[PDB]
Amino acid sequence: SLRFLYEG
Amino acid sequence: SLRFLYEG
Amino acid sequence: LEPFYVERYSWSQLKKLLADTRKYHGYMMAKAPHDFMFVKRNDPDGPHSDRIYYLAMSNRENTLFYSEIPKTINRAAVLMLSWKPLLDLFQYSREEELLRERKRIGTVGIASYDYHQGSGTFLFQAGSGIYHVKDGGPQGFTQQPLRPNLVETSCPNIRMDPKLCPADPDWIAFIHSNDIWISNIVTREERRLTYVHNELANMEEDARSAGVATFVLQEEFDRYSGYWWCPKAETTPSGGKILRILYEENDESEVEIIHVTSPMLETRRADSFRYPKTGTANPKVTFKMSEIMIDAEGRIIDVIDKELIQPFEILFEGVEYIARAGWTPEGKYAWSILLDRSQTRLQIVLISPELFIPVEDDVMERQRLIESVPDSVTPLIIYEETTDIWINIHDIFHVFPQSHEEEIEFIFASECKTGFRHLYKITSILKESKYKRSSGGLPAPSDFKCPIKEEIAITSGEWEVLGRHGSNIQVDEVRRLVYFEGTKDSPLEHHLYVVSYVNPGEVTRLTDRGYSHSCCISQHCDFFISKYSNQKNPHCVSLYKLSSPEDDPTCKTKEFWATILDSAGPLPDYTPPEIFSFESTTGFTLYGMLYKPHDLQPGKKYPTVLFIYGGPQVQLVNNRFKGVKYFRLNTLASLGYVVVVIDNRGSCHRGLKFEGAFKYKMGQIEIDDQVEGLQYLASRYDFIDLDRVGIHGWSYGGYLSLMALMQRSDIFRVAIAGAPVTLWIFYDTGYTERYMGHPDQNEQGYYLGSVAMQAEKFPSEPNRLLLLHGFLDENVHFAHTSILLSFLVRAGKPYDLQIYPQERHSIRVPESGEHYELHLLHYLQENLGSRIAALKV
Amino acid sequence: LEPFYVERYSWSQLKKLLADTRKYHGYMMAKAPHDFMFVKRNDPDGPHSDRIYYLAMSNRENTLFYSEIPKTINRAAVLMLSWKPLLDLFQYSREEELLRERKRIGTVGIASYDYHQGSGTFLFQAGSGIYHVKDGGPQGFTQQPLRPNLVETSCPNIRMDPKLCPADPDWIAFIHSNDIWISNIVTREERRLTYVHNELANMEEDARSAGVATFVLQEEFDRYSGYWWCPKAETTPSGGKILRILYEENDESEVEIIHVTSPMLETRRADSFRYPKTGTANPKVTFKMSEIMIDAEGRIIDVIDKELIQPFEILFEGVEYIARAGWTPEGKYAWSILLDRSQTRLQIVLISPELFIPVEDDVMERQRLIESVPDSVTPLIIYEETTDIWINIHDIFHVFPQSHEEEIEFIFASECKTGFRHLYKITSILKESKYKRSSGGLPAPSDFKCPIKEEIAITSGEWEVLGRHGSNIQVDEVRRLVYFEGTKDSPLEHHLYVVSYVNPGEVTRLTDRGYSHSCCISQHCDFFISKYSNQKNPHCVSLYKLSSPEDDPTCKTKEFWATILDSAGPLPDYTPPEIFSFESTTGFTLYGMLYKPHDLQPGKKYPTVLFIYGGPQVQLVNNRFKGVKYFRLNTLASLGYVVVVIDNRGSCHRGLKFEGAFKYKMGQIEIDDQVEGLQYLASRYDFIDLDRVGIHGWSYGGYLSLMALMQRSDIFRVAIAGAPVTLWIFYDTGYTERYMGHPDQNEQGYYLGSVAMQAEKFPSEPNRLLLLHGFLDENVHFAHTSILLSFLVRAGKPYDLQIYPQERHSIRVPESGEHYELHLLHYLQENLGSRIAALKV
């Protein structure tokens, strides 16, 4: 999936 | 050697 | 209308600003309770009906808690359920690290758990250790934290994917060095079941695994396990039993090997990865069965590894991917949801254990075993469907108890009939097949198809049932109802619904409007929990009791029982966005979000930042709290940027036709929708300065950020592209072929969709293009950026670049995220927002 | 004094400017004639005394030419020698590509050639093909281009490093898949001599090579061959002969393997390299000998591979590196120049062929062969020297004909006695050694040392003889003179000198002052060619006839004979720099170059760009034409930048003590010299604006550019660091240990010298730090940049980055160089020079 992960 | 090569 | 120019802070001052505003968002960034389970007390004298178990974060680690559900409540007051810790205190590897990328797990601790109802046995992994505890079975209910009991091992490496045998809670299985092992938690016996992989060998000459989901299945199909316990034990005359494990065996020998930079940068090395790039070989797959003979007192007598009577390619013609698998509730058949390469044909196929025979290299003894299996034993394709768009795999599949011998009854969901995902009750006839194995021919395409006796639509309309990311059904087999999540009231809100599956008609909404809900329904169908939020209010978690009116069991009502997690409350910094919409020239209503600049001055126009994803399987615009994950859009608004987000055609929760708009054409239509919505806002709101528009996104969002600057440099002044796809030939089979087809069948779409092939079309002015990328990215390889740069250099085009050397397709190290936010904010200031930015042209 | 702000051009306009100015420098960037050789006509009736052969570029490829040297000349006119092509017209691999990096070859075509005087046979590689032609031997002299004759082969892969056997010009040797082969160019017989490497295997399990110089020796010691033909054949009683090849056999099994990104970025792969990082294992080395028995009509009878009687580590105690090797002129001894690990001990060691015995795994037959070799046969250390700074390896070593049995006479050069490199005539006594192999002990350190009978200083003073990059001696054994290049007249100019080696006294300069000269002396010692230039005039190549006065053969004079290459002439765009100097507080005169801004306005101060190298083995500041390679410093001057270059302490051509200033302390002293010289200029020239100083350099220059910004942010506004060393632990043994020692013996120097360990010390303001790096760099790995970035991100520091994805430690693709120049010029404009740059703070 072209889905990045960043929650901060 | 820390010697780069660029002649243009 | 004169231009507003943002306050021009230094790098150190922006770091301070961002740090201060991050300081009051530690408590916000905390996992809500999840993975709920209801267990009945069965105690008439006691005050509690149920105990609920769940995973939650009380900066703490994720762990198991329980709460007590009372039989009665004081309906004047609001009951806050206290969180009791289930576990006492205790005394990453590469495969954990990668699984956490594949599952998109941001949090730390216990990720999941198993439970055996009949014994109360919990099984869960916590760090390297596999652990078990007992609660809520014959042994009763604890009033204090339980000690986790380590499952001891002689295995040297990390044990992955532990599962309790439902047939016997003394037994567990797990993966170790890509082979299936089992372990008995009472006797401590440990046994390797498959001998397919060698831990000591190099991956270049050792590409076989068992019980494991390969990269594409984890990344593109959300399947993380490759083995499944049979739920029932077969008794032997001896007094013991036979336990069964169906598993997938993979051979990745012909799959291409790529090299990804090793995290330990000091080594100056690179790890090997089996990566099936689009148009190249996926792994060679098959089904296998491990037959495990146990004696009267729980010791292993024997293990017989078994294979399909004929090859996988023969028995399951045209199948590339094992999308899902499992067992029927009595263990008579293994089931599987199978896809073809194009992902335009789905099949649900029952597989009997009698299709499997022992592995035998001796050709004489093998031929006796083949003929001993009857010709009546065959694969049973109980359901088959096709589409001209694509099959979206989901987790909805419920099999009812087998009532008649030659029939199977089940609920499935599909978009193939109407173009929206709906529930269908199906009954299939298990005929003896026309194909006979003795004759010595090969089976024709349709020879394993089952006739459809009954196919009733349970739901219908211009709205979808949800089957992904935790959304599922819950079937009440007593009252003959099915609970499900859906978009019926609104595409901006998820809601819980209920409907009959026998005489389907009225669909009753069980959740309150003005919130989006993610729900869990009790196995007993008398409670549900909702994790819910809206644009203004942070997420809450509440318990609701279900009941029927006296006169009609079909009708279902709900009543608030208790609060599990209270809302943190509206944060004073955070001003939420307004949801807008507009009728597109494409014929669809398109939704968006608008963050107005804070302290809006009249007679002044502000610089605009378009945050974008714009890709399949995601909806950014809905009625949920955006003050956690998208908190920095508010920060941009607080400094004077207009912030816009638009869900263009191709995004999800609007049916298959809407999603299918960019089939074969990714990158070609999305910016039209974005510009249209952006122009709608500018004519309506005069504070939007169209001369200073920036665009920013990650992954697909970064892809579109590059497409925006390439296609529409007239609109977009700056583009900040995060981990973008610049070349579709680099991306994998499962994703690319689904949306774009095979490269040879879409030469122009692949060309037009690849920005690296079109470097000449980028702007010749600098300070307009910023590329961001994690250096260690194994999903969207850094070569996307490196090759784009290569062609930009050849074309004489300027670029800016920032690498995050410790990151993959994610930002996990705090310092990376802080630097990213700081650099982005400073970039926007210097090249879009500020007064110096205007002078710079 | 008000600030001058440079004209602010767009990216497209700067591209135009640079392209226009590059358009009149195609003819400038062309290789001067080189690799000269003189051959006598021996024709009394003919008008020519000699024919000279040379490699030259007439955008053309490098090829062989000849010119005719007349017996007499018209001394009124100037003779221009016409270039006759030697060759007719014809009908990269990884190892060619890497060799061209190691040798620093920028040009295309024939890189070198062999010649056998007695037959006239030329041997040379041209592309993949090895070729030969005949001229100037018994067969006479051609008056038209000769057809190159391909040496045919059955070898599938590229043949490297071809050499003619001096003992028999029918035979050649070459390297193929890291093994030595031989081929007969008449009979076409081809034979593999060593069986040490397998072409089909992986390099991870196949680390042995023969006849090959490994990475460190090519990169750090300028040795590119690992095998050497014996110059004489031993006759056999049968009527045939024995040819010999000494060779180095290397085992790189224990050398660390790093991964460098593969040039084909689409593969997303990485190549394996044996890279000995500082403080880790170098290859295990030894000497071997191939004994090749040929019959009466040139067919190979047999090949006997032979090894040292005792191990290399026993016979050559303390030796890490085989720096050089060869044979004595009669072939009686093989010689070798050997270094210890610290490179503070050199040894010249003679090695007899009798030290080698046949390879035999049979322990019985081996023990007979060991005892058959006499104890008198032993290694002969003919010279040994030490230093507290370091041994600078050079190519000067001349062995005279052996006059007496127990003596050898030779010229060597050294800095160890006085601290400046001078020629010394040495005579060593070849005693029978105290160590006896029969006794069964091991030899003590001094047991192979030869007594020094005579050691006469041929040259002396506060100036050096040149022995690197083509500079060598030429010995006239008749007149007993030695020709050499030196710095006696000036450190800014190289000149040709001559002196007696018997009664050394007067040193006569044969070249004219006001130019720097690179010279070739004829083997017959009656001509020399000078390639010469100065700061104002482009390079010329002229032939000079040598002669003595009637009264004194010792005294040598010269006379201009002819021009080989005429000067292109002063280019109108190009204004050269002025050489300056200043007395440093360190006690040394330090030289520099100053490019004044073009059209210098009075009462105005200009932004300054300090171009820097500042590392060992290089001198940037001298009296040579800088309008080819450093043409863009003039371009910077033409736009309004002051450009400064300073040769700080540590640079070369100033003796060993001056070079030794930064031993153990690299990065700590260089910027003091640079700032001192920069402050000298500012007090003298008020047009230097010290508030706007930029610094830029490549490799060591990039290293110091980072050190400048880190140490002295008060001085330097911007730093542009090209392919820098950010971490000394990443760099190799040969270089790092020579200048900085072992990491454990210099913990603070390694720390202070590594900018990546000191990320916190960089500026918190952006637009001051620009990193540039070739992505495919196998010398200074990209990890230097990637790890620096990692720590800058952790420290919250800003950076700019540009990658050149097609480049290694060099810029070869034209588009890369164009983009680099464009981006650099634009960066300097926006962040140092222009009016907007001043506002930006």
Ligand SMILES: CCCCCCCCCCCCCCC(=O)O
């Ligand atoms: C200072 C400005 C920072 C902007 C914050 C942007 C948040 C980035 C979130 C990354 C993920 C986006 C894709 C969302 C999805 O596909 O689920």
Ligand SMILES: CCCCCCCCCCCCCCC(=O)O
């Ligand atoms: C537009 C500005 C361009 C500046 C040109 C700089 C030339 C770079 C030359 C690279 C090599 C330097 C090291 C010299 C050496 O060690 O021999």
Ligand SMILES: [Ca+2]
């Ligand atoms: Ca996934």
Ligand SMILES: [Ca+2]
């Ligand atoms: Ca070299």
